[PDB]
RNA sequence: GGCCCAUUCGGGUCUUGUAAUUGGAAUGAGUACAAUGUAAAUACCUUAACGAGGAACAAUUGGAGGGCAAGUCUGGUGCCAG
C-alpha cells in the first residue's frame, strides 16, 4: 500500500545494483495480442512459480477468483500499458507525500530533534 | 589550417561511427572514395565522413570541394583504420557517404548527428 | 455473486467527426500507414491526449515540486524507452509538443515496411498477420504491436516462417510435386 | 532526501533465525 | 546522337524517327474514316 | 581518355586499372602547393607489378 | 531529350537578360559572357547571327535556386542588365557565371564567399568573366571588403547559415541602394530544424523587416528543392 | 476540340451540383431570417 | 476496407500533384529540360503587399 | 407525440385509397386508411412504393412509425415481417 | 563465417556431426565449453548465442538481448556464462535455465576524466572477456582499456586507461605528398591523429588472481588482482 | 504579367500539416474584450483549450485598435502589453486590422487566428487549412484544428 | 486523356486509364493423423497430411446520380413538358 510505483524506478536507477532484464521475446503475453509484459506482473508471476517449485503441484485459478484477476489485469494493460510499461499510475490520484514524509514517531519534532540528527 | 579540418573530437566520432554502423545494416551506406563521388554527384548524400590518416591525405580532399559547391556537411575522424569497423567490411575506408533517404528507419539519429556536424562546421 | 470488475475503452469518438480537415487528415494517416480503420486513429489519439494532459498539469505545478518531478520525469522517461522522445528531449514541454505520427511510427508494421523487410505497408501487414516476423524470438501478428528500440533492433523473419530457414510453403512445394509428377 | 525519507519509512514498515529456512535446509538436506 | 542522325532543320530530325512516323500515320487514317 | 585510347579482356582491366591511378595523382598534384613525384613514382610501381601478373 | 542534332528556337523571357529555347522541351537560357566554354559541364547552345556565332549556356533550376525561382515564375527581378549585384555565398561559378550574364558587360558581380576551396575556382572563373569580383571573405564582417565593393543596386544572397539575416542587413546597410533590390533564399533545416518550414519563412520575413527592407514576394521552389523559398524585397531607408 | 468539348462536359455537371449548393443557402437563409425577426 | 482507402490515399496522391508541383527525388540523370514547356508572361508568385 | 409516447404505433389496413390513381408511383398511390388500435382513431399512412403497396392488404396487423402533405405516418412493418425485408425479397408474409 | 558448428574427434581430427546454424548472418564468432561439463555456448554474428550438448550433438536454447554482434564468449563452471556486444559496448551475463540476463554498460566520458586530472579515448567498442571469478569477469575495449566488473555493481569497479599503450604515429614522409618538411608535419595534427591499441585478447586463469592481455604491441602483459577484488596492477 | 498565387506547400488539400505544438496564434482586438468579459484569461486559457504551449502576437495594427478604444478598455491594453505576447510589426499604410489579420495567413500557413468578431470569421473559413479560435460560452474553442 | 478551382466567363496542372492479358510465391479459415491434458472426459497448448484466381473458400448497411423501348399515362402554342 505504501509503495508508489513511480518512486522505486529512481531507486533503480540511483541503486547502481543490476536489474535482471529478461529476453526480448520471452516478456510478451500472448503473441502480441497481449502488450509487452509490464514490470509488476513480471514480479507477480515469478511469485507462482517460486511458489509453484516449492509446493510440487500448480495452482488452478477457482471459476470465482478467476473472473476478477485476468480481464481487468489484461484491461488495465489495455487501457495502461502500451508497450509494457504502464501510463495508468498518474490518472490516478494519491498522496504520495505520506509515502515520502518521516510521518513515523521517529520525526523531527522540536528543534532539538533536529539538531541531533545534524549531528 | 589543417587540410584535415574540422576534426570530430573523441565524442562525436564515436556517435559518426554508431550511425555508420546501423546504416551498413540497412543498405543506406556507400563506403570508398570513389562511391563517396559518386553518390555527391547524383545529391543523394546527406553527409559524407572521411577519415584524417589516409596515407596520403591528397588522395580524399576532392571530396570537400564537391560538398561545399552543394552544400552537403562532411567530418573527419582520425583513423581511417577505425571506419572500417563501423562499415561492418574487412578492410580500411578513407572515405564513406550516408545517403538521403526521408523512408529509412535510422533517420532520427541521423539528423541528430547532421545536426551536429553543421555546428561543427 | 463476487466483486464486479473495471474495464474501459481504449478510445473515443471525436468531438466532431465531420470537419473536412479531420477527414482527409484519417485519410493521409491511414494512407500512409496503412491502417484498417478510423477506431485505431481514435485510440492512438485517445492516449495521446492523456498523456498530454497529464504533462499540462505536472506543468501547471511549480518547479521543484514532488508531484511535478517524479511523475514527469516518469513521464519522460517511459516516453523514451517506447522510443517517441529521443534521448536530447528529456523534457516535458518536448512533451507537449508530441504528435500522433510518431506513435504510429512506434508501430511494428511501420517497422517491418521500414527496416527493408516489406516493400509496402500493406505488404509488412500481411507479412506480421501472416507469422512471418518475429520480435527477437517471438512471433507477433499484431500490427498495432509498438516497438521499443532494443526491440526495434531485434526485428527479424521467423525461424518457422518460409522465407527465415524453414521449408517452402503450400504452394511452393505443391508446385515442386506436380512439376516432379 | 525524499527518496531517504521513503526508504525510512519503508523500513518502519517492514534469537533470529528464519521458520521458512529451517524448512529449506531439510528441503536441502532431502536434497 | 549521331552525325548521320543529325539534320540542319528539326523536322528532319522528326522524319528519321520511326516510331513518330508508325503512330502518326495511324491517326491520320483513324480521323480521315471520321471525316 | 577513351577516344584516343590514351590509357590503353585483359587489356581492359590493364586500362581500368590505370585509369584509377591516374585519378589519383591527379588529386595528389592539384591539391597539393609544390606536388612531388615521390607517391607518383610508387605509384606507377603497383602498376608494373599488376601489368606483371597479368 | 535535349540532344546534339537537335535544333531550337531561341526566344527572349520575360525578364530581360533571361531567354527560354523551345523545341520538344522548353529551357531557360542565358548568353554565354565567355563563347565556346562551360563553366560547371552545363549544356550550351550556339545560334549563327549576322556571320558570328553566338553562344548561348543552359541554366539548370535545380542546380541553381534562382533559375528554380524563374522556373517559379518571380514576379520582378532586380538582376538585369546594367545593374550591380552583390552576390553573397558564392560558392562558385555555378549560378554567378549566370548571373553575370544576366547583367551583362555593363554590369559587374560582386561574389563573396567564405570557404578557401570552392574560391580557387571562383576566381579562375572571375579571370574569364572581367566582370565578376570575387571576395573570398566572410560575409558576417562587411567591413572587411568594404574596400572592393561600390554603391550596389540589388543584393543576393543564398548562405546556408542560421544567423543569415544579420549578414543580409550589414551588407544592405553598407552597400544597398535605397529602393534597392534584397533577394534571399532561405533554407529552413540550417535555421531551424525543429519546426516546420512555415513557421520559419514567417520568422525570417519579420526579421528582414526590422532591418528596413521591404518584403514583396516569397516562392517555395517545388517541385525542383523541398523547403526552400526565394524572397524578393527592396530596401527602404527613408 | 476533344479537350475542349470535356470542359464543356464536366461544365455542366458542376453547374447542377452549384444550382443544388445555392438552393441549400436559399432555404437556409430564408428560414434564419424568420427565427431571428421571431424575437424581434 | 484497408484495399479501399489505399486505392483512395494514392488517388489523393495523384490528385495533389495536379492542384501543385511535388518533389520526385529531383533531378534523375542529365537535365532534359521543363518538359511541359515554359510560360513566358506567367507567374506564379505570393506578392507581399 | 404523434403516438402518445410510443415510438411506434399498430393499425388495421381499412382500404386503400390510392388503388385507382392511374399514374404508376403517384404520391396518393401508397396512401393507406388505418385504424389506431389502441384507440380506434383512423388515421393515412405512408408505404414505401408501389410495389410495397401489392404486400399490404385488408385486415393486416400494420405497425406505424412517424414520416401528400399530412400524412405524417409510414408503414414499416406488417403481420410478423417487415415491408422492407419483403421488398427485398427477404422473407415472405405470414398469414 | 561458414554458419556451421561441425565436431571432430580428437583422437583422428574426424568429423562425426554438422550442426548448421540455420541463419543467414549466423556466423560464429566465439565458442566457450562450461568447465568440467559437455555444455557448449557460442556466440554468433547475428546478434545471438547457441548453446549446445555436444554428447547429443543438439540444439538446446537461444539468448536474446544483444544490441550489437557478439564477438566473445566466457564460461565457468557454473551456467553464467559472460558476452560483450561490440558497439552495443554492453557486457551481459546469462542464467540459462531461467533465461534473464544481467546487463552490464560501462559509462564513462573523457570530459568528466580530464577535468578530474585538472590522452583518453572514448571507448568505441568492447572487444574482449574472460571470467576471472563466478562473481567477477574483466573485459577489454577498443581504446586499450582494462575494465573489472562485478555483479553487484552495474558499472566498472576498476579500469585501466591505455593498458596496451598508444599507436605509433604515422610516419610524416606518408602522411602528405608535399616537399616541405614542415608541411607534411601540420598534417600529422600533433598527437590528435594517435590512437590507442586495441585489446585484441583477454584470457584469465579461472579463479585465480591473474590474468593476460593481448595486443600486436609487441608483448603479453600479466595483471594481478588485488585481493580484495576491487583493482589490480601490472 | 499575370500572377496565380501558388497554393502553400503546407496544404495536403485543406489540412494544413505545418501548424503543430508550439502553435502561433494571432489575437484580434474583440477577442482580448471578450476574453475580459468571459474571465478567460489569456494564456492558460488558450493551454486549456489547446493541451500545447503557443506564441500569442498582437500586430501593431491590434495594438492599435485596442488603443484607439480608449479609457473604458484599458484592462485590454495591459493584458494586450504582456511580455509573453511578442509584437509583429507591420508595413502596410493603413491601421485597418482584419484586412491586415487576414492577409498574413494568406502568405504563411503557419498561424490560428483569435477573434470573435463576425466581421472577420468567414474570411477565415474559405481559406484552407487556417485554424479559427474563438471565445465562447466559458472557455475558449477552436474550430478548424483537427489536432485536438 | 486524367483531375483541380471558378454564381458568371473560363482558368490552373501532368503520366494517366483499362470495364486488357499474364507469371511465380505466402498463408488463414476449413478437411484433420496425434500426443498432451484430465478421476475419466471436454477444453487449452503444441503438432503430421490436405487446403486459393470468380482465390464462387462468393461480409452487410445507407445515400447520390444516371441512361435505355416500335412500352404506358397526363398536360400544352408541331418535333415539347411532367
Redesign the pocket.
Known amino acids: 500500500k505504501s509503495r508508489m510505483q513511480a518512486m522505486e524506478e529512481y531507486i533503480r536507477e540511483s541503486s547502481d545494483q543490476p536489474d535482471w532484464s529478461a529476453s526480448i521475446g520471452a516478456d510478451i503475453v500472448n503473441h502480441g495480442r497481449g502488450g509487452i509484459k509490464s514490470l509488476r506482473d513480471t514480479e507477480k508471476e515469478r511469485r507462482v512459480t517460486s511458489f509453484e517449485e516449492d509446493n510440487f503441484t500448480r495452482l488452478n485459478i477457482t471459476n470465482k477468483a478467476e473472473k476478477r484477476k485476468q480481464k481487468q489485469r489484461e484491461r488495465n494493460a489495455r487501457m495502461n500499458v502500451i508497450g509494457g510499461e504502464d501510463f495508468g499510475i498518474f490518472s490516478s490520484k494519491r498522496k504520495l507525500e505520506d509515502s515520502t514524509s518521516r510521518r513515523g514517531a521517529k520525526k523531527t519534532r522540536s528543534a532539538w530533534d533536529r539538531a541531533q540528527r545534524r549531528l | 589550417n589543417p587540410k584535415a579540418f574540422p576534426l570530430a573530437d573523441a565524442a562525436l566520432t564515436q556517435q559518426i561511427l554508431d550511425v555508420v554502423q546501423q546504416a551498413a545494416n540497412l543498405r543506406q551506406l556507400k563506403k570508398g572514395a570513389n562511391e563517396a563521388t559518386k553518390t555527391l554527384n547524383r545529391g543523394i548524400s546527406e553527409f559524407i565522413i572521411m577519415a584524417a590518416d589516409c596515407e596520403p591525405i591528397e588522395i580524399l580532399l576532392h571530396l570537400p570541394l564537391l560538398c561545399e559547391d552543394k552544400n552537403v556537411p562532411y567530418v573527419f575522424v582520425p583513423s581511417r583504420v577505425a571506419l572500417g569497423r563501423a562499415c561492418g567490411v574487412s578492410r580500411p575506408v578513407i572515405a564513406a557517404s550516408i545517403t538521403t533517404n526521408d523512408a529509412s528507419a535510422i533517420k532520427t539519429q541521423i539528423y541528430a548527428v547532421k545536426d551536429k556536424i553543421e555546428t561543427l562546421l | 455473486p463476487r466483486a464486479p470488475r473495471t474495464y474501459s475503452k481504449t478510445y473515443s469518438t471525436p468531438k466532431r467527426p465531420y470537419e473536412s480537415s479531420r477527414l482527409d487528415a484519417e485519410l493521409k494517416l491511414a494512407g500512409e500507414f496503412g491502417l484498417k480503420n478510423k477506431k485505431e486513429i481514435y485510440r492512438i489519439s485517445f492516449q495521446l491526449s492523456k498523456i498530454r494532459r497529464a504533462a499540462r498539469d505536472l506543468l501547471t505545478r511549480d518547479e521543484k515540486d514532488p508531484k511535478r518531478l517524479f511523475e514527469g520525469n516518469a513521464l519522460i522517461r517511459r516516453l523514451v524507452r517506447v522510443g517517441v522522445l529521443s534521448e536530447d528531449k528529456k523534457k516535458l514541454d518536448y512533451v507537449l509538443a508530441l504528435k500522433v505520427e510518431d506513435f504510429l511510427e512506434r508501430r511494428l508494421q511501420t517497422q517491418v515496411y521500414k527496416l527493408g523487410l516489406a516493400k509496402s505497408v500493406h505488404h509488412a501487414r500481411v507479412l506480421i498477420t501472416?507469422?512471418?516476423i518475429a520480435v527477437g524470438k517471438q512471433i507477433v501478428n499484431i500490427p498495432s504491436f509498438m516497438v521499443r528500440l532494443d526491440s526495434e533492433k531485434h526485428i527479424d523473419f521467423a525461424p518457422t516462417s518460409?522465407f527465415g530457414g524453414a521449408r517452402?510453403?503450400?504452394?511452393?512445394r505443391?508446385?515442386?510435386a506436380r512439376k516432379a509428377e | 532526501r525524499l527518496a531517504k525519507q521513503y526508504l525510512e519509512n519503508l523500513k518502519s514498515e517492514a534469537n533470529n533465525f528464519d521458520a521458512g529456512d529451517l524448512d529449506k535446509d531439510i528441503i536441502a538436506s532431502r536434497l | 546522337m549521331n552525325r548521320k542522325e543529325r539534320k540542319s532543320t528539326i523536322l528532319e530530325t522528326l522524319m528519321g524517327d520511326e516510331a513518330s512516323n508508325k503512330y502518326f500515320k495511324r491517326k491520320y487514317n483513324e480521323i480521315q474514316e471520321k471525316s | 581518355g577513351a577516344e584516343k585510347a590514351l590509357f590503353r579482356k585483359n587489356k581492359g582491366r590493364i586500362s581500368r586499372y590505370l585509369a584509377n591511378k591516374c585519378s589519383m595523382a591527379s588529386r595528389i598534384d592539384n591539391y597539393s602547393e609544390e606536388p612531388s613525384n615521390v607517391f607518383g613514382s610508387v605509384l606507377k610501381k603497383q602498376v608494373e607489378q599488376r601489368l606483371e601478373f597479368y | 531529350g535535349a540532344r546534339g542534332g537537335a535544333k531550337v528556337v531561341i526566344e527572349p523571357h520575360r525578364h530581360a537578360g533571361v531567354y527560354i529555347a523551345r523545341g520538344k522541351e522548353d529551357l531557360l537560357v542565358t548568353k554565354n559572357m565567355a563563347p565556346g566554354e562551360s563553366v560547371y559541364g552545363e549544356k550550351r547552345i550556339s545560334v549563327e547571327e549576322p556571320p558570328t556565332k553566338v553562344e548561348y549556356r543552359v541554366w539548370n533550376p535545380f542546380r541553381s535556386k534562382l533559375a528554380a525561382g524563374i522556373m517559379g515564375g518571380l514576379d520582378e527581378l532586380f538582376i538585369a542588365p546594367g545593374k550591380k549585384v552583390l552576390y553573397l555565398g558564392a560558392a562558385s561559378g555555378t549560378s554567378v557565371s549566370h548571373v553575370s550574364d544576366v547583367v551583362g558587360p555593363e554590369g559587374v558581380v560582386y561574389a563573396v564567399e567564405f570557404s578557401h576551396r570552392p574560391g580557387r575556382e571562383l576566381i579562375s572563373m572571375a579571370k574569364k568573366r572581367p566582370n565578376i569580383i570575387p571576395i573570398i571573405e566572410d560575409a558576417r564582417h562587411p567591413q572587411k571588403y568594404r574596400m572592393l565593393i561600390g554603391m550596389v543596386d540589388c543584393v543576393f544572397a543564398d548562405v546556408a547559415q542560421p544567423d543569415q539575416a544579420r549578414i543580409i542587413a550589414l551588407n544592405s546597410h553598407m552597400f544597398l541602394k535605397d529602393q534597392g533590390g534584397v533577394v534571399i533564399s532561405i533554407k529552413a533545416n540550417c535555421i531551424d530544424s525543429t519546426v516546420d518550414a512555415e513557421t520559419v519563412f514567417a520568422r525570417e520575413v519579420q526579421k528582414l523587416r526590422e532591418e528596413r527592407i521591404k518584403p514583396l514576394e516569397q516562392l517555395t521552389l517545388e517541385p525542383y528543392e523541398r523547403d526552400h523559398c526565394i524572397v524578393v524585397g527592396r530596401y527602404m531607408r527613408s | 476540340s476533344?479537350?475542349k468539348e470535356?470542359?464543356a462536359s464536366?461544365?455542366k455537371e458542376?453547374?447542377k451540383k452549384?444550382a443544388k449548393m445555392e438552393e441549400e443557402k436559399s432555404q437556409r437563409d430564408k428560414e434564419k431570417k424568420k427565427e431571428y425577426f421571431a424575437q424581434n | 476496407?484497408r484495399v479501399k482507402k489505399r486505392k483512395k490515399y494514392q488517388?489523393a496522391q495523384?490528385?495533389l500533384?495536379?492542384?501543385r508541383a511535388v518533389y520526385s527525388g529531383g533531378q534523375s540523370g542529365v537535365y532534359e529540360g521543363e518538359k511541359?514547356g515554359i510560360?513566358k508572361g506567367?507567374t506564379?508568385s505570393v506578392k507581399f503587399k | 407525440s404523434p403516438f402518445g409516447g410510443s415510438s411506434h404505433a399498430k393499425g388495421i389496413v381499412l382500404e386503400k385509397l390510392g388503388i385507382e390513381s392511374?399514374?404508376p408511383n403517384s404520391a396518393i398511390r401508397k396512401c393507406v386508411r388505418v385504424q389506431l388500435i389502441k384507440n380506434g382513431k383512423k388515421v393515412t399512412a405512408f408505404v414505401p412504393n408501389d410495389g410495397c403497396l401489392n404486400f399490404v392488404d385488408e385486415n393486416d396487423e400494420v405497425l406505424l412509425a412517424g414520416f401528400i402533405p399530412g400524412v405524417r405516418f409510414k408503414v414499416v412493418k406488417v403481420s410478423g415481417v417487415s415491408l422492407?425485408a419483403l421488398w427485398?425479397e427477404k422473407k415472405e408474409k405470414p398469414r | 563465417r561458414d554458419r556451421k558448428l561441425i565436431v571432430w574427434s580428437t583422437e583422428s581430427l574426424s568429423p562425426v556431426k554438422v550442426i548448421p546454424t540455420k541463419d543467414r548472418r549466423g556466423e560464429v564468432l566465439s565458442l566457450a565449453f562450461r568447465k568440467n561439463s559437455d555444455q557448449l555456448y557460442a556466440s554468433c554474428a547475428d546478434f545471438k548465442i547457441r548453446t549446445y550438448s555436444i554428447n547429443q550433438f543438439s540444439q538446446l536454447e537461444i539468448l536474446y538481448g544483444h544490441h550489437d554482434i557478439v564477438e566473445d564468449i566466457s564460461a565457468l563452471a557454473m551456467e553464467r556464462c559472460v558476452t560483450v556486444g561490440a558497439r552495443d559496448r554492453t557486457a551481459m551475463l546469462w542464467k540459462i535455465p531461467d533465461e534473464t540476463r544481467l546487463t552490464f554498460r560501462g559509462g564513462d566520458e573523457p570530459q568528466k576524466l580530464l577535468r578530474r586530472w585538472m590522452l583518453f579515448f572514448c571507448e568505441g567498442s568492447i572487444d574482449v572477456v574472460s571470467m576471472v571469478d563466478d562473481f567477477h569477469f574483466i573485459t577489454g575495449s577498443d581504446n586499450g582499456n582494462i575494465c573489472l566488473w562485478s555483479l553487484a555493481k552495474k558499472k566498472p569497479i576498476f579500469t585501466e586507461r591505455i593498458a596496451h599503450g598508444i599507436l605509433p604515429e604515422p610516419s610524416f614522409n606518408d602522411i602528405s605528398g608535399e616537399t616541405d618538411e614542415e608541411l607534411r608535419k601540420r598534417q600529422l595534427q600533433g598527437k590528435k591523429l594517435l590512437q590507442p591499441f586495441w585489446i585484441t585478447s583477454l584470457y584469465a586463469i579461472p579463479y585465480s588472481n591473474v590474468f593476460i592481455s593481448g595486443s600486436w604491441s609487441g608483448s603479453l602483459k600479466v595483471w594481478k588482482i588485488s585481493d580484495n577484488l576491487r583493482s589490480f596492477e601490472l | 504579367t499575370r500572377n496565380?498565387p501558388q497554393v502553400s506547400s503546407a496544404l495536403f488539400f485543406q489540412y494544413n500539416q505545418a501548424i503543430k505544438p508550439p502553435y502561433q496564434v494571432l489575437i484580434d482586438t474583440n477577442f482580448i474584450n471578450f476574453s475580459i468579459q468571459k474571465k478567460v484569461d489569456i494564456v492558460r486559457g488558450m493551454m486549456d483549450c489547446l493541451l500545447a504551449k503557443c506564441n500569442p502576437l498582437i500586430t501593431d495594427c491590434v495594438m492599435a485598435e485596442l488603443e484607439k478604444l480608449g479609457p473604458k478598455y484599458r484592462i485590454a491594453l495591459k493584458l494586450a502589453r504582456d511580455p509573453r505576447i511578442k509584437r509583429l510589426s507591420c508595413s502596410h499604410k493603413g491601421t485597418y486590422a482584419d484586412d491586415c489579420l487576414v492577409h498574413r495567413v494568406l502568405q504563411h500557413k503557419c498561424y490560428i487566428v483569435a477573434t470573435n468578431d463576425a466581421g472577420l470569421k468567414q474570411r477565415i473559413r474559405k481559406i484552407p487549412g487556417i485554424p479559427l479560435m474563438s471565445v465562447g460560452g466559458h472557455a475558449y474553442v477552436i474550430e478548424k484544428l483537427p489536432d485536438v
Do not use: D, E, F, W
Request: net charge positive; glycine share 2%.
Open positions: 501472416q507469422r512471418h518460409p517452402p510453403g503450400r504452394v511452393a505443391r508446385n515442386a | 476533344k479537350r470535356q470542359k464536366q461544365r458542376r453547374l452549384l | 476496407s488517388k495523384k490528385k500533384k495536379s492542384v511541359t510560360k506567367l506564379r | 392511374k399514374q422492407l427485398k | 496565380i
